[PDB]
Write an enzyme that holds these catalytic residues in place. Structure first.
Site, mmCIF file in Angstrom:
data_model
loop_
_atom_site.group_PDB
_atom_site.id
_atom_site.type_symbol
_atom_site.label_atom_id
_atom_site.label_comp_id
_atom_site.label_asym_id
_atom_site.label_seq_id
_atom_site.Cartn_x
_atom_site.Cartn_y
_atom_site.Cartn_z
ATOM 1 N N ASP A 1 -8.740 1.489 -10.371
ATOM 2 C CA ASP A 1 -7.524 1.060 -10.855
ATOM 3 C C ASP A 1 -6.536 0.587 -9.692
ATOM 4 O OD1 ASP A 1 -5.210 0.245 -12.801
ATOM 5 O OD2 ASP A 1 -4.483 1.730 -11.708
ATOM 6 N N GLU B 1 -10.359 -2.914 -8.843
ATOM 7 C CA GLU B 1 -9.441 -3.789 -9.278
ATOM 8 C C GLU B 1 -8.768 -4.454 -8.249
ATOM 9 O OE1 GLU B 1 -6.003 -2.983 -10.904
ATOM 10 O OE2 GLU B 1 -5.606 -4.803 -12.071
ATOM 11 N N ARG C 1 0.898 -1.169 -0.078
ATOM 12 C CA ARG C 1 -0.009 -0.016 0.011
ATOM 13 C C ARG C 1 0.810 1.239 -0.045
ATOM 14 N NH1 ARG C 1 -3.383 -3.293 3.052
ATOM 15 N NH2 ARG C 1 -5.424 -3.902 1.598
ATOM 16 N N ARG D 1 -19.035 -8.232 -17.238
ATOM 17 C CA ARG D 1 -18.235 -6.996 -18.257
ATOM 18 C C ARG D 1 -17.627 -8.034 -19.285
ATOM 19 N NH1 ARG D 1 -13.181 -4.265 -15.492
ATOM 20 N NH2 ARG D 1 -12.412 -6.466 -16.001
HETATM 21 CA CA LIG Z 1 -0.378 2.999 -2.601
HETATM 22 CL CL LIG Z 2 -10.237 -4.999 -14.324
#
Ligand SMILES: [Ca+2]
Ligand SMILES: [Cl-]
EC number: 3.2.1.1
Length: 496
Positions: A197, A233, A158, A337
């Site tokens: 994203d 994602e 992270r 999707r």
């Molecule tokens: Ca990050």
């Molecule tokens: Cl994706």
């Protein structure tokens, strides 16, 4: 954040990967609306680094320079025109939000950017935002390199740089606010939601803090109090400290297990077979259906990026791909999707595609328009899977059967399977090395139905196979193992 905000009766998103805004706008009006598509995932609409080595790769769009709506897909007026025209015909727009990072730390300073904005990665200077050195995680990251080195350590995943991408300090109110400013710009234009994203590389709580700042959806097109659809994602195939479920507070999550497993099944690899699909969904260890964003392939894994995987099916394996997409669209699990791709000159050297970087069809860097051939396919090297009859018709199958229970399952203990969706649709697959010839209970009202895989219903008749359902719901199906498309699908709207 869990509701798609699609029109009632529309149930899928299509990824129009790298398409220009003017082309998507036309596509909404001429195709997506009349064919019942729910919406479109667009490529990142914010300004990115123009990368010339290699030559304008698709992945340059995952390296932000600013939040100006100025890219190879078009400018802000073009983007706004697209969202308006799409919403006006009931087709939604979902933005690929690149918010974890700016560009790579080794990119040269200057104006090599899609709107010509100055940026200096070395000095962490993005004056078009603006961001400065204070807005990145350089002091927070604990690794020697400053990059992510070990995915077993959830903290560095992270706080450190994903492959050298400058990591935004999303713990800071200022950074959260600049990101929300960008996302609210998009919401007010009329976007219906976001693909977030690189969600694994952000703390669930930082994402939460950003979403707290977001507007409700534009009140001309959406009921008052509508929230942006969020799908995150997160690649979680198990065995890592970070889990897809950690992100359920923010919205839906991509289920990457889905396409990996379905590809293996349809390829008949690893001892897997279609008869095992009887308990598809949570029975295969997947996340809750009401949180899954599902897909056969995505823009990363169709070219071996992301988690890649040899089992992934793509347009390159067209016959098996149509079967996998067909199964996905017929089955009630998840929100679907559909991928829409371009061709590139794939070239394998020691196991890998050395051209997996190639961007969209272009004239010296300028993205080519999507041309429509007289047979309704696309020109200029756009694949347009969403226009393939077998896929387009399955998109409508899913609409027609929306809400109906998985029922009337049949299997031969190998790769010949069938199932229904209440009394509204029925689908039959043959992936064995011999002919499937059998009378099956369909659950459907008696009548003559057009097979929507081999053909279309055109007021009064069928251009492909016809299936005849008797008064007791039974119908005969014959599918050769040599069939170009070894599956048949019928539904309430394909009945004569
Ligand atoms: Ca990050
Ligand atoms: Cl994706």
């Amino acid at each position: 954040q869990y509701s798609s905000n699609t029109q009632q009766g529309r149930t899928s998103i299509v990824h129009l990967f790298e398409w220009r805004w003017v082309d998507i706008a036309l596509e909404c009006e001429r195709y997506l609306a009349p064919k019942g598509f729910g919406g479109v995932q667009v490529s990142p609409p914010n300004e990115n680094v123009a990368i010339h080595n290699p030559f304008r790769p698709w992945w340059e769009r995952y390296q932000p320079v600013s939040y100006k709506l100025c890219t190879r897909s078009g400018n802000e007026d073009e983007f706004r025109n697209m969202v308006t025209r799409c919403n006006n015909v009931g087709v939604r727009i979902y933005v690929d939000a690149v918010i974890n990072h700016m560009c790579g730390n080794a990119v040269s300073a200057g104006t090599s950017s899609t709107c010509g904005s100055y940026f200096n990665p070395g000095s962490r200077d993005f004056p078009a935002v603006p961001y400065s050195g204070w807005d990145f995680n350089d002091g927070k990251c604990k690794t020697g390199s400053g990059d992510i080195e070990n995915m077993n350590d959830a903290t560095q995943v992270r706080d450190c740089r994903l492959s050298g991408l400058l990591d935004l300090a999303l713990g800071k109110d200022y950074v959260r606010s600049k990101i929300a400013e960008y996302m609210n710009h998009l919401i007010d234009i009329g976007v219906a939601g976001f693909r977030i994203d690189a969600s694994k590389h952000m703390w669930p709580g930082d994402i939460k803090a950003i979403l707290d700042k977001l507007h409700n959806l534009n009140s001309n097109w959406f009921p008052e109090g509508s929230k942006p659809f969020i799908y995150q994602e997160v690649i979680d195939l198990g065995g890592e400290p970070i889990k897809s479920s950690d992100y359920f507070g923010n919205g839906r999550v991509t289920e990457f297990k889905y396409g990996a497993k379905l590809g293996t099944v349809i390829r008949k690899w690893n001892g897997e077979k279609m008869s095992y699909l009887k308990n598809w969904g949570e029975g295969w260890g997947f996340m809750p259906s009401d949180r899954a964003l599902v897909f056969v392939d995505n823009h990363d894994n169709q070219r071996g990026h992301g988690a890649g995987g040899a089992s992934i099916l793509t347009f390159w394996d067209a016959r098996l791909y149509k079967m996998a997409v067909g199964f996905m669209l017929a089955h009630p699990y998840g929100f679907t999707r559909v991928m829409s791709s371009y061709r590139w000159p794939r070239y394998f050297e020691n196991g890998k595609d050395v051209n997996d970087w190639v961007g969209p069809p272009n004239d010296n860097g300028v993205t080519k328009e999507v041309t429509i051939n007289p047979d309704t396919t696309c020109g200029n090297d756009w694949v347009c899977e969403h226009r393939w009859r077998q896929i387009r018709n399955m998109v409508n199958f899913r609409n027609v059967v929306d809400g109906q229970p998985f029922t009337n399952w049949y299997d031969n203990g190998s790769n010949q399977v069938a199932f229904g969706r209440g009394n509204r649709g029925f689908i039959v697959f043959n992936n064995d090395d011999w002919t499937f010839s059998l009378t099956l209970q369909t659950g459907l009202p008696a009548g003559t139905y057009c097979d929507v895989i081999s053909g279309d219903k055109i007021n009064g008749n069928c251009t492909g196979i016809k299936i005849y359902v008797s008064d007791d719901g039974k119908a005969h199906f014959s599918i050769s193992n040599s069939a170009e498309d070894p599956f048949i699908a019928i539904h309430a709207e394909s009945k004569l």
